[PDB]
Write a protein that binds this ligand. Structure first.
Ligand code: CLA
Ligand code: CLA
Ligand code: CLA
Ligand code: CLA
Ligand code: CLA
Ligand SMILES: CC(C)=CCC/C(C)=C\CC/C(C)=C\CC/C(C)=C\CC/C(C)=C\CC/C(C)=C\CC/C(C)=C\CC/C(C)=C\CC/C(C)=C\CC1=CC(=O)C(C)=C(C)C1=O
Ligand SMILES: CCCCCCCCCCCCCCCCCC(=O)OC[C@H](CO[C@@H]1O[C@H](CO)[C@H](O)[C@H](O)[C@H]1O)OC(=O)CCCCCCCCCCCCCCCCC
Ligand SMILES: CCCCCCCCCCCCCCCC(=O)OC[C@H](COP(=O)(O)OC[C@@H](O)CO)OC(=O)CCCCCCCCCCCCCCC
Ligand SMILES: CCCCCCCCCCCCCCCC(=O)OC[C@H](COP(=O)(O)OC[C@@H](O)CO)OC(=O)CCCCCCCCCCCCCCC
Ligand SMILES: CCCCCCCCCCCCCCCC(=O)OC[C@H](COP(=O)(O)OC[C@@H](O)CO)OC(=O)CCCCCCCCCCCCCCC
Ligand code: HEC
Ligand code: OEX
Ligand SMILES: [Fe+2]
Lengths: 30, 84, 192, 167, 504, 30, 135, 170, 29
């Protein structure tokens, strides 16, 4: 496979997943 | 390592009726051979009934004797999965 | 009869020209360099030969269902054409049959692989990879000999146990064939 | 494996030329149309309850008794969009149509597969238009037939020992 | 609070923090162009622009620097073929470093305009509200655009104070950077004539200067201001998104179709130069111009440039890769080491057979050797048992003229058939499948990738134009329609005109 | 201005990403 | 083009007989009545070796690229070399007992099947007797 | 059938987002249509419910509370916002048909997801590794060689009766 | 690296478990 094939997906899962979890903890906390 | 069926094409099998290798359907290109004599041949360049000997001798310049193991095993001398 | 069977995979001193009329063989020891993942399409049956008396009865088989594709799971699956194709075996029959037969390739020359590549039909290239193999590209038909030693119960119809040693599918040269040893029982029904 | 099943099915049963599959495409293209239609006419017709500084989704509170969108404006919109009588100004008659169009569509399409189970294949117009001499004037259904031939001579390349693909 | 997709709408009534968010976008874009060109320098093999040029290495922004005069490196290499050159500051390194230096400077400017949003320049003097004079702003920026359109055309592109641009011969062999004079006649609208590209920017620069002066000193009509909602800046967004997708559609076409702006030594051959056999006709045009001088075939083919025969190879077609076949073209076939030569196919009759070249549609293509009179004389068969036209049967030999194999003839049909499956790709080349693990799976050029991004951006910006034009014309209603919307407002025939309450 | 992201939007937006990456991982590894 | 006497001239026995546009259209229908279940398009479905091509039929023993030879086949069908006799597996007028779709075929109606089999390869081309490769 | 043979457009991920969008739209058409029609309030004394709606009314014609409790226990999740439901009905076929657009723009340049390079590396040196993927690619070679001399007459594809990819007996 | 990435599906089941049983509930309002 591509050796950049998991980094293309880990930074596709986790990069918006970090974004939507950051957004949720800053609106859970109000 | 060469494909033995394709290496069979460049020799006299792939110019005439190789009597050891061609399908029984490849005899239809001439008169008298198919299906009685073609059954008798498939089953040195062939010789039985006397009119059959005259059909064969008129065709003997069209006949080749060169046994290839892929081309004959598994009953491919009679049916090779080659239809219309 | 046939309705109370659908056993079809199972086979059921005796003293001039003689003939073997119905030779069954019901078996797979595979040499490590099993199971039967083929369900019950494994027995040879209805084999007709010519028992030629010489002291030794030469058995030139000719005709019958005398090949069976068998895949055994070692977990590697090992296809073998279990066969007694064109067997010439030899020994008042009481008696072994120390015979040598030829296995062909499992897949014949019309067989196409997943990439279209076969021997008499198909691609001699690897058309998936256009600018790139040759072992899998060129299909190499095997016909290696196998040896079988039948060991003859006796009535006209006799029975016992065979043991054949043949190689596996070599995948038309693409990998190495395992040595399969096929133990099992047999039944031959001799009639002049 | 699904795409294998679709390709082989068209090779053997000509599913595209089967009208029950064509009613099914009419059920899912219409189903996706009338979804995006109904989804956009209700969203077009939402009453202002919120500010532009927060989402319009909070104009709905769950269990409320007022309808969250103006059905008269959406019918006034969509009725002027085509013509007034093409338009479901009845919300119940609207949602029956949203219910029934993909469902009867996919019913017929499942009846496509279930009838091409028993080899009642699609419409076979191979060599239908022929000229005065009798030469076959190929059609678009003859171009499909060559594509259909392409998949069917290649599906299960080793499974067929006989010239006709019966089942 | 705000929805996640509405978080940037805190900058509409904040023009100073709109400038800062813009300065940061422009810092990231200029930062990328520096970062992409420095990464491109770190992977560019420059020692062979004949058989391994920038479009074989997936060099994205190296041809955009190249097409406006940037030609050398501080390392020493020029892309035009020389080594040891001092191109001054404006190398591929110095351009990239200028873009990083710009990006840090636009960063700190964005930091300034974010903190100091509350400047009186944005505040309207008559109502104390942060207001942008978008008509006057437009004419100011249109004046600046035409100043920089004229000066790029009439100083940079003309070469009078500037390098010029990348010019080519039609087959892209001796293409370099030259000053180009403006074409003022009708041949300047030929997109392949670079004199029109210079003369566009001179002429559109003046017209943009003239119009920029117009929109400074002429105010919008009362009915054009209100039709477009010119007080709102969402209308500047919706018409600028409308412009940039038109413009991205144009650069998708002029990359794909080719222009003077998109040459083939920089972005690669177009797919239409393989469709027409546009290099094959030129290759045979040179060969027959020595076949009538008396120069024999081995001579008349050892004079074809290796760069010219490389353009006549299907692994340089941009319609030949795939969406996830990633990386350089050299990740596909490989690095072209040398031309193997022109494979001439002759049967045992000794009559010349011509391979049916593969179209860009096809992943697989059967090898089929027609003659000049069109009838098929040889093929590599699928079913070989009932065959009639195999290479083994018809005695097909292959001879090579020019290239590596100049004067070699292969008659044994396995070696003829291997060269025949490479002759469906055009001219046959010897590839290095060892430098970068080239798996034979064809890749796309920077010409094909740029068209994909900029026609998918332009389509994605079609929706953005629609969405933001919807937001502009319907600004009162994106919280929802009126609760006091009368049933007699959308009822038919209660008003003589749709929308107007005075027509009842 | 604060960003609100309710838990359903964390749940759909994670669903949007994970089934996007379950799709495209076959192509990113290629 | 147009169906015409240049197409409707086919060898009768070394003589050619002319079909009509009624007769060729009748014998397409009598071919689809009793022959084209196996001989659709000029092939043989139950024996894909023996196509109904003119070259195949000219090479049969006796020659069956004639109309007198094809009506002699439909009254006495032989093998391709004429040795073995196949009226018990092939439809004929000697086998009205077992092929009931042959019983109403008269001597002016078999000549149209003999007419259709010979005229049609000139009409289709390689498609008659060519199979699915030539569809 | 062109795009299957030449582009392998089924395998393209942008077409699958379109199939998920269209069939999701047709599902959300059928589900929301039947959910509303089976959570209706009884507003008329007749057994045919369509005459229990005049459009000038401002009542919900169906029980969104029951509809949410139906789908929460049948399927697990339910809409509870009727505005978010109908935006999702706008969203799902429109994002699907927009994703199919991005694939076709790629297929304009023949940027297919034709092949998983890792599998045809596996299948070209192993003649026993068969997946349904390599079976579809064998079908596409069938389409591209059997259809093209007829589909593309300008190319003058004269494909002989022996270059055609054919399995056994067909 | 291949299959254990794909086994993204285990995150989907955890989201399937969380969005069913731990959703912020619909409130009758
Ligand atoms: C008088 C000298 C002059 C000359 C020689 C040119 C020459 C050109 N113009 Mg320019 N133009 C000029 C003045 C001139 N222009 C003026 C005064 C204006 C008004 C500001 C324009 C506005 C303009 C626009 C909007 C476009 C051009 C484009 C072009 C290019 C056309 C070929 C092409 O690739 O189109 C391809 C594009 C299309 C066919 C657009 C339709 C879709 C060619 C270089 C086109 C271009 O730059 O493409 C690279 C283009 O889109 N011109
Ligand atoms: C300050 C001056 C400056 C200079 C001299 C350069 C120079 C360069 N840039 Mg850089 N760049 C700059 C600022 C600059 N840049 C800034 C501020 C940014 C951030 C926005 C960038 C972001 C950037 C990127 C992402 C890239 C470059 C690239 C380049 C190189 C090629 C440019 C090219 O061919 O594209 C063509 C340029 C245009 C077509 C200009 C567009 C003008 C359009 C056509 C106007 C149309 C609308 C108009 C307003 C309508 C009215 C017209 C009116 C006259 C009628 C060149 C070395 C490329 C490169 O090679 O990087 C190393 C590249 O990829 N630049
Ligand atoms: C207009 C947008 C655009 C285009 C058309 C290209 C085009 C290219 N890039 Mg570039 N790149 C870009 C923006 C772009 N890039 C951006 C925004 C970044 C920062 C993330 C990069 C970072 C980058 C790296 C690190 C590399 C490339 C490479 C490439 C080349 C190989 C194609 C590929 O693998 O894509 C595949 C596309 C997809 C999988 C779509 C999803 C191709 C010429 C490669 C190359 O060959 O460089 C020498 C390479 O190694 N690009
Ligand atoms: C220069 C072009 C431009 C500019 C200045 C804007 C600006 C805006 N858009 Mg618009 N829009 C554009 C083009 C643009 N858009 C395009 C091309 C599309 C179609 C895709 C849209 C479709 C669109 C919709 C449907 C909506 C907006 C909205 C908005 C507003 C809020 C943005 C926000 O907070 O997102 C927040 C963004 C994030 C949290 C990041 C996620 C965004 C996606 C998933 C990834 C972004 C891509 C990546 C990071 C980099 C892109 C590189 C670029 C080359 C494309 C803001 C006014 C919103 C609005 O109008 O509210 C009132 C809104 O609902 N836009
Ligand atoms: C079975 C499931 C399935 C589903 C749901 C889809 C769904 C779709 N396909 Mg796919 N397709 C499938 C299987 C499927 N396909 C298979 C197995 C193949 C063979 C590989 C294809 C080959 C295929 C191709 C070649 C194309 C699609 C396209 C599409 C999109 C159609 C968009 C549309 O509505 O155009 C319909 C037309 C419009 C929406 C425009 C309408 C214009 C106005 C409104 C009409 C007014 C009149 C009689 C008188 C009429 C849609 C996503 C298309 C696409 O990707 O679009 C980008 C496309 O080109 N599909
Ligand atoms: C590997 C596999 C991945 C598969 C794949 C390709 C996925 C693509 C993903 C993707 C980004 C696609 C782009 C296009 C797109 C956005 C498609 C979305 C498809 C989609 C999510 C459809 C919705 C399907 C779904 C589960 C709907 C639920 C319907 C439902 C429970 C309704 C309940 C309901 C109905 C009412 O009517 C009322 C009233 C109430 C109350 C109520 O609850
Ligand atoms: C973060 C999420 C990223 C998802 C999108 C990118 C996935 C790419 C998968 C991958 O492994 O690519 C891997 C590739 C790298 O590809 C490698 O390149 C090297 C040369 O520099 C090697 O020589 C190899 O040839 C090659 O494997 O990364 C990219 O180039 C992707 C480019 C992305 C920008 C272009 C998009 C244009 C169209 C839109
Ligand atoms: C670097 C960039 C990384 C970030 C990229 C984008 C990451 C977020 C994308 C997903 C967020 C969706 C968050 C979400 O799901 O809902 C949020 C939004 C609905 O918003 P509401 O009106 O409910 O607003 C309430 C707030 O929670 C919104 O923030 O959804 C949409 O409008 C688009 C639909 C996308 C999902 C539909 C398919 C789901 C299956
Ligand atoms: C045929 C339509 C079948 C679509 C299946 C999905 C229906 C869900 C939508 C649903 O639940 O049905 C609701 C909708 C209304 O039902 P009604 O209560 O009005 O009719 C049922 C009986 O009482 C007859 O009035 O049913 C129909 O309109 C049937 C019309 C068939 C006319 C013949
Ligand atoms: C069965 C397992 C399905 C789990 C899907 C999980 C995705 C979030 C599902 C979830 O957490 O909430 C279920 C959600 C409905 O939630 P609401 O209507 O309350 O959302 C209000 C808005 O603020 C959402 O942005 O359903 C959908 O949006 C579409 C169906 C899934 C696509
Ligand atoms: C299926 C049962 C058939 C029907 C109905 C008809 N034919 Fe036939 N035909 C069939 C076979 C199996 C064969 C081959 C026989 C053999 O010798 O092995 C044939 C052959 C012919 C031929 C000879 C073709 C040749 O190569 O010489 C002819 C001329 C012929 N068939 C004609 C024919 C006609 C006119 C029919 C309709 C009345 C007809 N056949 C019906 C199988 C079948
Ligand atoms: O298995 Mn799946 O597909 Ca129903 O057809 Mn016969 O079988 Mn096979 O060929 Mn075609
Ligand atoms: Fe609704």
């Amino acid at each position: 496979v591509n050796q950049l094939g998991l980094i293309a997906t880990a930074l596709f899962v986790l990069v918006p997943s970090v974004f939507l979890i950051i957004l949720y903890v800053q609106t859970e906390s109000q | 390592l060469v494909n033995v069926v394709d290496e069979k094409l460049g020799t006299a099998y792939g110019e005439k009726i190789d009597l050891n290798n061609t399908n029984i359907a490849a005899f239809i290109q001439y008169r008298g051979l198919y299906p009685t004599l073609a059954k008798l041949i498939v089953k040195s360049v062939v010789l039985l009934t006397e009119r059959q000997k005259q059909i064969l001798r008129e065709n003997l310049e069209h006949f080749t004797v060169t046994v290839e193991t892929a081309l004959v095993e598994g009953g491919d001398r009679y049916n090779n999965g080659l239809y219309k | 009869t046939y309705d109370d069977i659908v056993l079809a995979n199972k086979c059921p001193a005796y003293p001039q020209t003689y003939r073997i009329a119905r030779l069954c063989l019901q078996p797979f020891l595979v040499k490590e360099e099993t199971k039967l993942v083929t369900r019950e399409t494994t027995s040879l049956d209805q084999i007709q030969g010519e028992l030629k008396v010489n002291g030794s009865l030469t058995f030139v088989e000719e005709d019958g269902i005398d090949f069976q594709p068998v895949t055994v799971q070692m977990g590697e699956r090992i296809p073998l054409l279990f066969t007694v194709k064109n067997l010439v075996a030899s020994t008042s029959i009481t008696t072994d049959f120390k015979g040598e037969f030829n296995v062909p390739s499992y897949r014949t020359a019309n067989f196409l692989d997943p990439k279209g590549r076969g021997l008499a039909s198909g691609y001699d290239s690897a058309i998936a990879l256009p600018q790139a193999l040759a072992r899998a590209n060129v299909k190499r038909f095997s016909l290696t000999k196998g040896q079988i030693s039948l060991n003859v119960k006796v009535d006209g119809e006799i029975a016992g146990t065979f043991e054949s040693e043949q190689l596996s599918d070599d995948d038309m040269g693409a990998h190495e064939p395992h040595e399969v040893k096929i133990q099992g029982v047999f039944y031959a029904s001799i009639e002049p | 494996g699904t795409f294998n099943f679709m390709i082989v099915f068209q090779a053997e049963h000509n599913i595209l030329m089967h009208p029950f599959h064509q009613l099914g495409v009419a059920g899912v293209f219409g189903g996706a149309l009338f979804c995006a239609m109904h989804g956009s006419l209700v969203t077009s017709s939402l009453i202002r309850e919120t500010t532009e500084t927060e989402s319009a989704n909070y104009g709905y509170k769950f269990g409320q008794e007022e309808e969250t969108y103006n059905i008269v404006a959406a019918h006034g919109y969509f009725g002027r969009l085509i013509f007034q009588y093409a338009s479901f100004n009845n919300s119940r008659s609207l949602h029956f149509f949203l219910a029934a169009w993909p469902v009867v569509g996919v019913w017929f399409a499942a009846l496509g597969i279930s009838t091409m189970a028993f080899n009642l294949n699609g419409f076979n117009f191979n060599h239908s238009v022929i000229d005065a001499k009798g030469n076959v004037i190929n059609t678009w259904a003859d171009i499909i037939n060559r594509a259909n031939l392409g998949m069917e001579v290649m599906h299960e390349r080793n499974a067929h020992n006989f010239p006709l693909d019966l089942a | 609070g705000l929805p996640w997709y509405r978080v940037h709408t805190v900058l509409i009534n904040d023009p100073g923090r709109l400038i800062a968010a813009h300065l940061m976008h422009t810092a990231l874009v200029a930062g990328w162009a520096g970062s992409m060109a420095l990464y491109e320098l770190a992977t560019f093999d420059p020692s062979d622009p004949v058989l391994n040029p920038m479009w074989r290495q997936g060099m994205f922004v190296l041809p955009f620097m190249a097409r406006l005069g940037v030609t050398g490196s501080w390392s020493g290499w020029s892309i035009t073929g020389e080594t040891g050159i001092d191109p001054g500051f404006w190398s591929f390194e110095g351009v990239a470093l200028a873009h990083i230096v710009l990006s840090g400077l636009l960063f700190l400017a964005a930091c300034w305009h974010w903190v100091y949003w509350d400047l009186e320049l944005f505040r309207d003097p008559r109502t104390g509200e942060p207001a942008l004079d978008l008509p006057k702003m437009f004419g100011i920026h249109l004046f600046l655009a035409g100043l920089l359109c004229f000066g790029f055309g009439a100083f940079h592109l003309t070469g009078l104070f500037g390098p010029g641009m990348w010019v080519s011969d039609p087959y892209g062999l001796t293409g370099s950077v030259q000053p180009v004079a403006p074409e003022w006649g009708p041949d300047g609208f030929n997109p392949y004539n670079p004199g029109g590209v210079v003369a566009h920017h001179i002429a559109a620069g003046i017209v943009g200067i003239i119009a920029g002066l117009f929109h400074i000193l002429v105010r919008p009509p009362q009915r054009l201001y209100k039709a477009l909602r010119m007080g709102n800046i969402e209308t500047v967004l919706s018409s600028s998104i409308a412009a940039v997708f038109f413009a991205a559609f144009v650069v998708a076409g002029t990359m794909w179709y080719g222009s003077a702006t998109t040459p083939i030594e920089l972005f690669g051959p177009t797919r239409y130069q393989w469709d027409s056999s546009y290099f094959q006709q030129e290759i045979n045009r040179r060969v027959q111009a020595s076949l009538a001088s008396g120069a024999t075939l081995e001579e008349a083919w050892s004079a074809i440039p290796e760069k010219l025969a490389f353009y006549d190879y299907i692994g340089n077609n941009p319609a030949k890769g795939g969406l996830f076949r990633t990386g350089p073209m050299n990740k596909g076939d490989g690095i072209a080491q040398a031309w193997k030569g022109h494979a001439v196919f002759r049967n045992k009759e000794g009559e010349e057979l011509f391979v049916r070249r593969m179209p860009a549609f096809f992943e697989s293509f059967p090898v089929i050797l027609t003659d000049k009179n069109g009838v098929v004389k040889a093929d590599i068969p699928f079913r070989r048992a009932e065959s009639k036209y195999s290479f083994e049967q018809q005695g097909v030999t292959v001879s090579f003229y020019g290239g590596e194999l100049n004067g070699q003839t292969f008659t044994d049909p396995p070696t003829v058939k291997s060269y025949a499956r490479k002759a469906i790709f055009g001219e046959i080349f010897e590839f290095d499948t060892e430098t970068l693990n080239s798996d034979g799976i064809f890749r796309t050029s920077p010409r094909g990738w740029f068209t994909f991004a900029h026609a998918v951006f332009a389509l994605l910006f079609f929706f953005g134009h629609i969405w933001h034009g919807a937001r502009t014309l319907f600004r009162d209603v994106f919280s929802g329609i009126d609760p006091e919307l009368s049933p007699e407002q959308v009822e038919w025939g209660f008003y003589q005109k749709v929308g107007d309450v005075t027509t009842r | 201005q604060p960003v609100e992201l309710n838990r359903t939007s964390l749940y759909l937006g994670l669903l949007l990403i994970l089934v996007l990456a379950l799709l495209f991982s076959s192509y990113f590894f290629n | 083009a147009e169906l015409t006497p240049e197409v409707l001239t086919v060898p009768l026995n070394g003589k050619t007989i002319t079909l009509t546009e009624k007769q060729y259209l009748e014998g397409k229908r009598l071919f689809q009545y009793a022959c084209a279940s196996c001989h659709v398009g000029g092939i043989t479905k139950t024996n894909p070796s023996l196509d109904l091509r003119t070259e195949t039929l000219a090479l049969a023993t006796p020659p069956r690229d004639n109309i007198e030879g094809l009506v002699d086949y439909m009254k006495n069908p032989t093998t391709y070399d004429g040795e073995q006799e196949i009226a018990e597996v092939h439809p004929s007028l000697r086998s009205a007992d077992i092929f009931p779709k042959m019983r109403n075929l008269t001597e002016k109606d078999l000549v149209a099947i003999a007419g259709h089999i010979l005229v049609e390869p000139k009409i289709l081309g390689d498609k008659w007797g060519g199979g699915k490769v030539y569809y | 059938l062109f795009f299957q043979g030449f582009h392998n457009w089924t395998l393209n991920p942008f077409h699958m987002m379109g199939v998920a969008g269209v069939l999701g739209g047709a599902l959300l058409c059928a589900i929301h249509g039947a959910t509303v029609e089976n959570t209706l309030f009884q507003d008329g004394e007749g057994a045919s419910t369509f005459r229990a709606f005049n459009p000038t009314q401002a009542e919900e014609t169906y029980s969104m509370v029951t509809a949410n409790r139906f789908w929460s226990q049948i399927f697990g999740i339910a809409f509870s916002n009727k505005r978010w439901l109908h935006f999702f009905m706008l969203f799902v076929p429109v994002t699907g048909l927009w994703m199919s657009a991005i694939g076709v723009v790629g297929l304009a340049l023949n940027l297919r997801s034709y092949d998983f390079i890792s599998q045809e590396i596996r299948a070209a040196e192993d003649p026993e590794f068969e997946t349904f993927y390599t079976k579809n690619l064998l079908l596409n070679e069938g389409i591209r060689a059997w259809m093209a001399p007829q589909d593309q007459p300008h190319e003058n594809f004269v494909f002989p009766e022996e270059v055609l990819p054919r399995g056994n007996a067909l | 690296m291949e299959t254990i990435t794909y086994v993204i599906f285990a995150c989907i089941i955890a989201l399937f478990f969380f969005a069913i049983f731990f959703r912020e509930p619909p409130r009758i309002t």
